[model samples]
Target: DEFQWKGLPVVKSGLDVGGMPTGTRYHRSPAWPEEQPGETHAPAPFGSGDKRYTFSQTEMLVNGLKPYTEPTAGVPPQLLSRAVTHVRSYIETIIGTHRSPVLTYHQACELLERTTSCGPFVQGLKGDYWDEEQQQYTGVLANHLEQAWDKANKGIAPRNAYKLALKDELRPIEKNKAGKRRLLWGCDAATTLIATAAFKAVATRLQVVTPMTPVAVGINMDSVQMQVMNDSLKGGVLYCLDYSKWDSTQNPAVTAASLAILERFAEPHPIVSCAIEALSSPAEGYVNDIKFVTRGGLPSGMPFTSVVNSINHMIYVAAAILQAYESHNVPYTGNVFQVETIHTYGGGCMYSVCPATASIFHTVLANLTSYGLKPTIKPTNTPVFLKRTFTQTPHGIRALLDITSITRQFYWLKANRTSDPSSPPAFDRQARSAQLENALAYASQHGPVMFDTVRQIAIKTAQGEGLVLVNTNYDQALATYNAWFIGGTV
Candidate 1:
């Protein structure tokens, strides 16, 4: 049975969910199953912004044979979301061996947003079903199927066949009209599961999707595993960081992994690039005002380090782009891909994650655009994303913004060093220090262009000269000298 029910003999398996253990029982009622499982199957911890759900009796009736109950009072949304996710895993049976060109519905829509139209590709799928009461073809699904019926079928008129309608209201773009761009198909096959869900929600509402690749950017010749988990699935296209935790340097494994994946999945497909530049904290006095949700792992509240990890991911992206451009002699003229991720701990998407990610990406994009980099921010938006728990379920969430576009609308992408009266006030001393730490980290790596990006932002920030100091100099001389070191004739 795809969907399990209550009071059923819940099967026990050596369950592994998202590289983490799901323990003996798939799920147990906290109140009823007072006797918990053994040590080999202890519950894992959740990350920040992860959803927590409560159990409810009515959920069984509402979902109708669906395995788990609805979120009640005690359980958090994150837990319930994970349980439902487990059930949804069964959908894979229906989605058998797929390949390039013909992507899932979500991929199709996302491709439209990036390469072609910036809206959804609408299609009215009509199908037929038996009308038990009417004993006729009066069913809504059937009627719709009639509209979508394909006349190409042979003598056998597929009885349960459904028709597809041509409508503009919901189905915005006409069929196949959205496939008119440099499509990067089959690049993100691994993370298709999460991508599908994300694309569907955005496509239905916005009529388009910001295309995402399953490739990860590398730094120098390092070869760290770019296997990042999203929605409890090994996603495609991840930030393949070095194994030495926070330290990212030259590692042969990273290079080997990059070469292997590239060979296995084409250079551009599952592509490997470099993080030529890096940002540690923030520029001296430049502040990250985003506040992450304190749920999940951070039940004790998120600290400054939490913020650093989120910001660090972007820094790696910038560095990767710079390194790739220099080595390949490719024009770094704005055709770069910026890899920004939602915090593994935070909950809501961009709007809610750290409450600062939007602003951070906004700032980063502004700086990048100033250097003439047109970064394609992947995973545009999400109400929820990832969380880190032993169970490998989505506990935390983060939103990936299309910093490329967001910069255009907000005008922050213009790369101005001038203080805007319209801009929000500056951060306090502590916040300023954090921003400075991040800025210094970014400036020291890459080249002058990146350094300048942070410096300019610092000078304009409303921090109003807090006198927070760092070892590096965010000055004009550094840019020219740094450029020289990186082999750029400034």
Candidate 2:
């Protein structure tokens, strides 16, 4: 016969750990005459966060169930906030499979802040278990169903269901809107488990109904794997896969589904253009092609070097536009008019003076407008961007501003004089010596002035000076040259 409880062999264990009531268990206190078939099996309470109680208590008592507990004592709120930020960042970065290189820090930040939220998309779990529950099926019972739900059936409903499950009972507090609660799934098993108990205890001691959840989630990419331990009849003792350790670059398949979702959302927006550009080609093309540079892995190819920069730039543009759309109440439109008008004098005139510079500057303007900030300075006529190199100085900008020294170096190169035999012969040696001397003279005479000039330019450009200009478009070519000149000057 099936195990009985009370008068039967199987009974509900009234004991609750970390708010999860121990489910049906064998009556061990009374101690059965012998171990019955399937007597080692146990089930966790419905929808509980703890996966450890999925097996029988008698088996756990003999083999021992390792306690899964979160750190309750002195966990900071900043840590939890940072953890959420990281999870969001990681999701954004790899949302695109092969195109993971396109999402930038700015884009990731924007994605996290999006007003329209999808619960299952962000939370990494999906299912409408209400009907499945009625059928008494364990198929949809697991918290992380992984592949159990069909793509068509899964949507925002599961997210709403999860939120409804946690609504007022008090374990993980609800911070998301109706469709945004799946972010709680971002909270790993250990983090959610420990935090719920710790906060509830705090609430109990302080005589409050719901204890404020600690901000610290207590698990990061490295420790995420340690959170789950699985004990099954056939599988025996196994562990859940560590998502933080999964290499997105190695396996783009996992993110293919996510990429499709992101594309669907971006299809109607200006963001689609940026995403397409990121995947189709590298920015500015002043550098090597994306496939050639990042995936070459050849004898001389530098893999993953500029990949980060390219992706970040794409994301930056996407984020800026999104930010502009979101913060429409801000005074500025982050349009071309604003880009052409701001800081046009001396070193500050850098953006307005060059079309290439303006392209990069537009994104900066958009970002600034999103925050309701604007450049107060009027445009100036003086061109502060000079073309020269200062390879002699430690800072790499020694003779860039000195016209006389550059002429001297040019003459020295023309004369083709050799200083040291230790150097290259003919033109190489002469040109090298001249360049070095020019840089040294410039460094000795005008180093301080040059540093101030670049600093002033950087200040005027409003971090626009930091933008990487590629040779992909005509404007980019112009911007790239100016950037190279500015880069050398610095």
Candidate 3:
């Protein structure tokens, strides 16, 4: 029997109600057992975001079951609107998968403001069991089913399934229209409809996210795991970082960083061209969340040291941009934050769970200590966000503005510099330091321009990837230089 109610031998084939009306003495009490033996054995985690409910609540929710009492305490109330239909449809699958209740309801509704999709194999499921390399079955599928027949031939989960999602390169891109590839499996709709219904609630929340407000909103990366609870055994480069922030009076800095980003992104080389130029053969390249997310690894050789500079120059560029925003009173806020995260393929499709995200607080906490600003962390087993706010000091804010002095580059070398130091090559190191200083001075003296792009490109050959550049590409080069370094900056 799937359900073992209260240690009694409640059998599945075992049938009978507690007390029948045989003598008109029927009463409202538990059955010969608690629930039907068709008990669920759901085996996946809740889809993502605000998972709420108890162990039994999840099991009791299946396709045909009547609504067992829905969890309410501590649960957000805005879900019952458009999400009602969603909850109904979402309940159609998962015979015994984990998160039945969570994915079916709470997660189904929270999708409006944010979104997440299947990592890899899940999206391109083509009716056949495919491997990471896109290999494999169907009649084969029926045979390859989990917990197979008449034999103990099985030992573990399908390698083809987890590998494609966890660590492989190259997954399928969507062949859809109306925008981009959507989670055909329905994850997006789960979020979109609910998000639409909750527009008022969302808009209302954004209003209170102002500079003067004591709260901050942070976007976290998706939790990527190589294997379930398999860490400490299989060491790997885990990744995640936060990119967008709503508070942290560093509003001026935030606004400035944003402008620098566009300029950096649009560099003639396309971030794509110059990047590939650096090492990806002479074919040119494009920038992405992953490239920067894993930047802390090896230099494979680039004048990596110098690359870190063009990276910092963008901040100095922001310093100048900040000057402009402040000059016109362009209306901005003053909140503060620095954690790592990148927005790629929009938001919701992918995220992180690595070093950058893991140790995001050390430095800011350092600041909190120096000027003595004790902060509090949100108490939850899940989440990678910031703040329990404190009032700002004019002095602290001013000191915080001197960007270069307080923050240091994380370098293209992936290993930890603090505890897991790997003092890199001499040339790369010096080039990184000198190049960064010169670029900062230049951006500070004059806002970054075509000359800036060229300046950054010139050092590539001697720095990070040692690429050779030709004429007419100098300005474009610096533009590529600016954004490339920025992504891996933290």
Candidate 4:
């Protein structure tokens, strides 16, 4: 949403330098007598200071036609009217299709101003002009100075009614050029399309209109909300549906035993199950197995990433709820089914390994372990618990000389490493050294803020806040420890 400006001086000067044209008035350094010492040389008198200028593209778009419609000198009313027509047509089309749409206020106004030559409409979406009442565009240009700047700097208006518009075209192009015909807006489009498919799957399986039997819809809620609900269900008995390290298909007896244990305390309350599957990445070319079956032949598909994150969080929430209920001699009405899979998506992998996020896995692991339950972990889909031994990289003696960098890398390696026993180590000694050095260099180049963060992390670790150190600020702690151990500046 940027406009290029070029100024051309059409006026010619009556001067000559052989065949070359030159101007006498436009002097680089005019020959003048030097001023004597203490000469009374007051400043140039200056103009009256009252000046006027045209508006910028930003100004025209933001202020709308109201300012342009004013009968000011050199202002064209027809141009303003044409702009109004342009904006109105775009707004009408959007309104007609969506019927009632919930849009970010600026987008709503942009659509309304689309027909007009307003900077807000032209240079791109601007301002919070939500039409909450009639669902129309509305805003207040309350500050006159800002309003004046917007109206005066008519930088560059759209040359024609037809504007080059790029909506959700997120696909990368070869040679930085997209092919003719746009692809749907990547993630946004996927979510919308998947949502429709998921809804259809739910409606068909659940029989929303008419259920053969009583059906209870399980909503995915946050941990805080889930805890509040579980707390409210204090009087009722709930059973946690816990799975152990046994193949359900091969070891039918083990599967039966797990379910049997659950059934022992599973009566009175509706059997609610929550399973969080690994998110498939487009980069990894993994397909998400969204299709899932609830108890009694009910079928459903996985929701979009937003719901996936919520579901992921809820798995641990369910575990916490189950733990709280069991600890107080208050059993769940029935087992809460949970399936926490390993995150395979590399992008998702980053956050998934962070200590704050890893705590969820820890919560589930600890809860199950307390009951003498050894849950099955999928190597490709489970957390790889950090080992203190592996954190220390043994090779690359020269690179590992920077104790601060080495320690930070160790902590990072541990925090990012998986807990899944079957999974291979993500880093080798050489790679670890390189990565640690690179990270240290990056932190150093990034300057004070990040350096200070690293320092603070070290201090916290030295103070014995191991939980935060291990889970959240592991890298900083390690860095700090190593720096101090080597007697190097942090």
Candidate 5:
């Protein structure tokens, strides 16, 4: 979605800067040379108005009127593209696959312009200003949203698709660097990737699918035509996600859970699980049972410490998700501590590789590869265990098909068993029923708007997931889930 901050430069974060030199720009001095009062630059004719001066004192302007004919040190298209490409490379290399493609800089910028700038513009309705409170059209609307609608587009675009793309950039460091490929509860990153892509596809009309939520497949009503769709969306998938709230202490168990999960789910090629297990996980952890494992403290007395911390944050999020998913129902009445095992020498504890975590990452990586999606930084060497595991499998050739087919089967199992809700979904029916039966009923009177808002929120919640998948083929994962669901059975 196009961000609506009052005056911040919307184009600052949209460029590629991987190849640029690092240097700080200077600020203009506050003091200025005194000039004669009412001084004029040069001789001016009576009616000719202002005269031009050969030289004049100037101050640096932020996002000034100066026009850029080509890519500069920091411009939206080129700089953003470079940075995005580099980050994409890093993720691909680290993630060990290419199926998850990095979005181009131009595409990334387009997303920014459309969502942060264009979508908000249309939501404003007839005017240039956004009606934050009303949240509907107020003034004449134009640009991206309008163009889509005017062309008879199918759905209204979401607002945060752009913001999530920018946010996705920070994940590599956190997931790959800091958390060490660990997982945590909350689908924020994954959800953004999946949901944003869905929004763009629907907006661009490349796909006829409408977005679905964890709760239900949403119905889209045509405003002018006033028609409700019966089958606009299909699926029971819910994108569950969250972000880390920074505090003094760190948690590695969360990461361990994610790793464990990934190991279990790694499919398409069971060997990837073996490879990750063999290459990445210190064998010592296997024997020692992750003894002496400690959360690596954030770097200190360093320039890139902050960046490194961001990397760790990204890495461990997956872990948290696993931890939450695994024991979410269990109560945590007492504080618990986890150990980190990563090294074998010099007092360094070896970090244990969770079987489940390796399994999942491996499977996803292999599946993504089959789909021709390559990540930015893929592992160069396959582990011996990965090779051995796949080689020994009964049917390694059909591994991915087997892996994915049953992997999400559990989702349907649970959804199928759920009983119908006692109440109508969201607030629509409650409001309608109240309006028809008891207009004076308190819930009936106000339930409609609140219900609609809740429904909208549930739908809007998926936009962040879309953002995460914009550059990755994982967009399909979102689409599939929107068409299906993550709860109920598996």
Candidate 6:
């Protein structure tokens, strides 16, 4: 998601230079000195003059791109396919009767619920265990786990004397890698080997059904169409899928059932492969966060709202898939993602850049369409970082910020000014409601034409410019602000 911001190339994090190199390019950097300026890949002139772009640069706006291409190391489909083939070896190793029939997602659900076959599938199930009747998986998988364990124990009567275990098959309580309580199906080595082969059969079946290759699924499908998509996209934006934090289990049988059930929902496998194979150092780690930029990588021409809504739908779909597995008391697998997950040892974390991006857009668009007062205006997510993107997206963020800054200045003045005798009063709430409504109403109207001359002072403050000089430009900035937002009378 980022390149090194001007420092020594990190060996472990660097693109090339594996101790044992494969001779294939690990990651191709953007045209640096030849086409653009540096690895940040700022908007710039190409070698050709005719189709070149005219870029206006600012200190705050280097790589603040909506959907810029970041170097993704490793051949994704090739990598996942190899993982697939390695699992496929398990099928070949299995002699004859050991070969189990492949199960569809719902089919896996039935099997998972049966649990007599994969008793560990339930016998070992402990966290967030659900006692769902077969009544649900079909519909709830469409809708989208937890507290069911609380629900299972919390005052609800038992349906039947269900086997939480059979003949001590479920072992004593222990902690999983995540430091949570876990119970494993205590299988002998021979059965564990069979379990491994069964999971391989699951993997082999999925691979046969879907190529999991570039054209069949991974990013950049149909070059001609992709080219057209890139050409069509002009604005910048962000939205993404994060399967990183999902609740998953590791024992082979449960992992296979979880995967099959995930496939059943609708196989919109993530376009990108998980990242551990690229880093190559930490053995079986995972980082599969899917992203969308209104850039080339992001499919072009879909309506903005539609893209946001679709992303929300993906969250629902993934939630439902995980729920399906959890409901049947099946242990879902970690690191088996078109997506990715957590590990046992010193691991990693990925925060979704979602809440900031998709959130602000959805809020701004709503305010724009509000036309008049609503019962309450949802205050948008505001932070210092949001100030950085103002001039970048032309989303009228500068307008909103300017409008906010002006009112806040007055709010401060009203509270601190010459109130010699009276204590400062709590500011009026209704006044703020009207103020915000006006700010959004006008900001939405003029936010698009927000001038780049009105730069946030922090860029310079961080560069050592003083707040003394910062607000000297404030008066003119305010004048310019009114000209655009208050009908351009001047």
- lDDT against true structure, model 6: 0.24
Candidate 6: tens digits of C-alpha lDDT, residues 1-490: 4333322111222122111101111111111112211112111221122022222221111222221223211112333333443233322333222333433333333333223211211222221232367432332221211121122223221111111111111111121111121111122111222222223343344334322211111112112222222222223232222222121101122222223332332222221011111111111110112111111111111111121222222222233333334445555453222222101100011112222222333442232122111111222222111121122223222312444443222212122112121223334444533443333333332332332222331223222211232222333444433454334222
lDDT of 2 by residue, 211-280 (tens): 0111111112011111110001011211111111011121111122222323432323223333322222
Query: How many backbone clashes are present in model 5?
Result: 131
Task: Using TM-score as the measure, name the better of candidate 1 and candidate 2.
Answer: 1
Q: lDDT tens string, model 5, 368-408?
A: 22322222212211111100111111211110122212211
RMSD of each: 27.5, 29.8, 26.8, 28.2, 26.5, 27.9
Q: How many angstroms is residue 139 displaced in model 6 relative to the true structure, after the best TM-score fit?
A: 51
**For model 1, how does the per-residue alpha-carbon lDDT over 1-490 read when each residue is reduced to its tens digit?**
1223243222222221111111111122111223322212211111121113122322211222111121112112233233222222221122222221212332322332222211111122111223335543344533332332322111112111011111111111121132111111111111222222222232222111111221111111101111122432222222211212121121222222222222221121211111100011111110011111111111111112122222223233344334434444544443222223322211111211122233344454344333222333432222222211112112112122222211111111111121221233332456545444444443444345655554544443323433454524545434433343343232
lDDT of 6 at 157: 18
Candidate 2 ranges with C-alpha deviation above 4 Å:
1-325, 331-431, 444-490
What lDDT does the true structure give each of the candidates? 0.24, 0.24, 0.22, 0.25, 0.22, 0.24
Output the number of the TM-score-best candidate: 3
Clashes of each: 70, 16, 47, 41, 131, 2
Candidate 6 residues lying further than 4 Å off, grouped into runs, are 1-36, 41-196, 211-490
- In lDDT terms, how accurate is model 4? 0.25
TM-score of each: 0.18, 0.18, 0.20, 0.18, 0.17, 0.17
Where is the poorest 10-residue window by lDDT in model 6?
271-280
Candidate 3 vs candidate 6, TM-score winner: 3
What is candidate 1's local distance difference test score?
A: 0.24
* Stronger candidate by TM-score (4 vs 5): 4
